[PDB]
Amino acid sequence: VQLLESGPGVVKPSETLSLTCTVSGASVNNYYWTWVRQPPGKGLEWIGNVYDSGDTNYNPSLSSRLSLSMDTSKNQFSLRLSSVTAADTATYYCARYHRHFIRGPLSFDYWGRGTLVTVSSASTKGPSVFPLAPSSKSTSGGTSALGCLVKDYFPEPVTVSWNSGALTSGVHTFPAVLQSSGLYSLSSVVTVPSSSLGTQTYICNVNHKPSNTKVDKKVEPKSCD
């Protein structure tokens, strides 16, 4: 029995969001399901439930714009959220509302891996990668730090790797930050032996699927030499 969600990663404000959960190993009609969101910054928030009886058990804070349902032919249950605003941005999870007819409500025992829904007017855009070159300013002992600045991209996410996944030790890819431009920007760095700085080739592999942007940047040392 497995649960996989699917729907847009981005939803333009004031529009209506549509998230769907596909089930496996079980018939949607024979169980009760639910949706829970996690607004970055906050915790967990119960959205509402969906049953075969079509009963209405939604959170009062969403009631007016929410609509849950089940589609037995496609074996899925879904979520409809009208008039989304930045306050609706969050990773949404679908799950099973485990209940026992005599004992009552037990838990939410099967959960999907969730999907991040970002409410933004921003237009899809690829990143521009700049080098964070190793230098006397980024060296201490026999260790030097270098990296890549993935600036101005939308929406999330972008993945980074070094030397096509060959270099992973000492790598640090930071959480991205949203700029007032409405575009994201993160950085990935790596500390490497200072001695290899002339011999070993360092290249960060940036990939942003939303905009089919694949950038490979080589990071060269920077000195007065």
Binding site: A95, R113, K137, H172, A176, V177, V189
Partner: protein
Amino acid sequence: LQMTQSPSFLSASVGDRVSITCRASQDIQKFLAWYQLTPGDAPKLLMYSASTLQSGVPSRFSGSGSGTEFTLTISGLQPEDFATYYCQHLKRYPYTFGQGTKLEISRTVAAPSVFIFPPSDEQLKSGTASVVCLLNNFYPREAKVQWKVDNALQSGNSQESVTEQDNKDSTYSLSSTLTLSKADYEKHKVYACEVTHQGLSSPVTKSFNRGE
């Protein structure tokens, strides 16, 4: 009906027996469940009906309580037990969760290694400079960063982020960015990154001179 968790953050060593509590604004008898949330994984149910261990969950996890107070207890914390926990009541709708409890590993205080990266010639072409300050592998996670251009303290023209405690050395890393215009960048010489951390008796300053 609200659920309050405490502590919100708890630090412990691997192998310790730790206990998280969850209180309820009202009496919910045993209708309370616990969950483990590690970023990247789907939330895992660990306990329900307050003390019934979920199928496939190591016995080091145990729940107790009824009424308004409940307790989740972990014996011998494992590397992977260090995540965030949330309790939930199921007394009546709307069902709600506690604000969660993040559990991280405690270790010795380590000052960050501060490196600074001036903007790349390539980015300057466009017309905006991004100066980056890196605080690498430090503990505790608390750390403040202040940019100084020609000594003038900066404000509102920088953003930053920290990684999650490393799996290997339990250290944290931080990345700050000073975003100035090209013309504003070619206007000054000294670009300073002032770092404040427990391991540093006094704020350290790592800077460089533009065009040098």
